[PDB]
Swiss-Prot record:
Distribution of this protein across tissues and organs: Found in all tissues tested, particularly abundant in skeletal muscle.
Protein name: Methionine synthase reductase
Residues annotated for FAD binding in this entry: 221-224, 257-260, 446
FAD-binding FR-type domain location: 42-288
Gene this chain is encoded by: MTRR
Catalytic activity: 2 methylcob(III)alamin-[methionine synthase] + 2 S-adenosyl-L-homocysteine + NADP(+) + H(+) = 2 cob(II)alamin-[methionine synthase] + 2 S-adenosyl-L-methionine + NADPH; 2 cob(II)alamin + A + 2 H2O + 2 H(+) = 2 aquacob(III)alamin + AH2
Disease tied to this protein: Homocystinuria-megaloblastic anemia, cblE type: An autosomal recessive inborn error of metabolism resulting from defects in the cobalamin-dependent pathway that converts homocysteine to methionine. It causes delayed psychomotor development, megaloblastic anemia, homocystinuria, and hypomethioninemia. Cells from patients with HMAE fail to incorporate methyltetrahydrofolate into methionine in whole cells, but cell extracts show normal methionine synthase activity in the presence of a reducing agent. Neural tube defects, folate-sensitive: The most common NTDs are open spina bifida (myelomeningocele) and anencephaly.
A GO term from the CC aspect: nucleoplasm
Residues that coordinate or bind NADP(+): 61, 365-366, 373-375, 408
Note: It is debated whether the reduction of free aquacob(II)alamin occurs spontaneously or is enzyme catalyzed.
GO biological process terms, semicolon-separated: cobalamin metabolic process; folic acid metabolic process; homocysteine catabolic process; homocysteine metabolic process; methionine biosynthetic process; S-adenosylmethionine cycle
EC code(s) of this entry: 1.16.1.8
Organism: Homo sapiens (Human)
Subunit structure: Forms a multiprotein complex with MMACHC, MMADHC and MTR.
Amino acid sequence: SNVVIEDFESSLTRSVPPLSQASLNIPGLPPEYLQVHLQESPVFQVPISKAVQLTTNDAIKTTLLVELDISNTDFSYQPGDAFSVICPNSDSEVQSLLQRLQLEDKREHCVLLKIKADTKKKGATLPQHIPAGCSLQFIFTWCLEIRAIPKKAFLRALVDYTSDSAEKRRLQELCSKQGAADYSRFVRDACACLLDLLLAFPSCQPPLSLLLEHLPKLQPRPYSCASSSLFHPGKLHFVFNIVEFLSTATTEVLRKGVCTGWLALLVASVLAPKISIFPRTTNSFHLPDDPSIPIIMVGPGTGIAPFIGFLQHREKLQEQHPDGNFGAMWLFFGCRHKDRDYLFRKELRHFLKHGILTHLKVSFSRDAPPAKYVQDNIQLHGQQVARILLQENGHIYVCGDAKNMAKDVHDALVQIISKEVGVEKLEAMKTLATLKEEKRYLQDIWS
C-alpha cells in the first residue's frame, strides 16, 4: 500500500470545484505588533490521595472520581461549589509543536516580549496571559491554548509565511468568503488545531511572534465539589468523564480533552501527584439555608456530582440532630445502562436506607424493557413535584453537561405546572421564570 487519493476527494489540504476555481475575497492582514526575543539563561497545590473508576470497562464514556487532600491548606468549600484546576498541555503535543517551529532546541530559552516600534496596530499591548521571562517550554505547556481552533484571521496571517503555491492557495481559500463551508467542515467541525494545520501545510513557517499574537490563554477548567467536608474531613472530591473526540491528527484517531486527559494520566498509579486549584469567588448552587425546605435534584450522568455532596452533607446534619425537621430530598438520576454507568449505585442505596434520600427515580436511556430520560420520571411524579415547588417553598436543582437536557427538563416542568394547577402554558412559563428569579430553580450546566 502506497496512499492513493481519487480526483473527487476534498479534505483540509485540497478543494474541488467551485471553490478550487473561485475568485477569493480574503480578509485584511492583521497588523503584527509583538517582538519576541529568545534569551538563553490565591492558588493551592494539593495532592491526589485517591481515584476510583466509577464506570464499567465497556462504558462508552469513562467516569472517574478524584479525591484531593486539602488538609494542608486554608481552602474551604460547601457542597455545590465549583473550583478551577490549572492543567498543562500534553508534553508530546508541546514537543511536536516546538519541533515543527524549529524551536525544540530553544525550549529552555526565556521569552522576552516587547511591542514592535514599527507596528500599525493602534492600542497594542502585551498579552496578559504570557508571563514575561518564562521559558518557551513553560509558556507552551501552561499558558497557551495550543488546542484552539485557528480563527480565519490567524489563517490569513499564515498565508504570508507559506511558500508553496498550492498550500498558500488552500489557506487563502480557508479564510475567504467563498471558503466558509470548507472552513466549517475541515477546520471548525474537525477540531483542527495549529499543530494539525502546520503538519498539513509543511511550507508554512510562521514566526513565534505571530503565534503569540493569536494563541489564546490556556484556561483553567472548573469542576463541581462532589463531597461535603462534614463527611470526608480534609478531602475534596470531584467527578468527571474523560473527554474523547475525533480530530485532524493524522497518526491519532481520538484526542482526549486537555484537563481530563491530563487528570487521567496523573491518577493511573493512584487508581502522590499534585495539582493546583483555586476557588471560584461566587458560588450559588447550594443547599437551602433552612434544612426543613424540601428539594428536588435532577442530575443525569456526571451531573449527579454536586448532589452526592448535598446528600453527604445532609447525612451528617441529620446525625447531629435526629428528630430535626428535615425537608424531603428527591433525586432524578439518568444514565445509559443499568449495568455500565449507574454512578454511585451503592452510595445512593445507603442514602435511601438511612432516610437521607427520600425518593430516587432512575432512568436508563439505552436499556431494553419505562422512563428513558429524567424528564420522563419528573412528569410521572408531576403532582408531587408541583406541590413541593408551589406549596412547600421547595427548591429544584438541575445539573449536567447538556443545555438540551436543561431545556427538556424546563419544558417538562412547564407541562407539569400547567396540568397540575390548571393554568395556561404562558402562566406556567412565567411561574418557572419567577422561581429562577426567587433562586428556587437553580441550574449548573457545564457546556
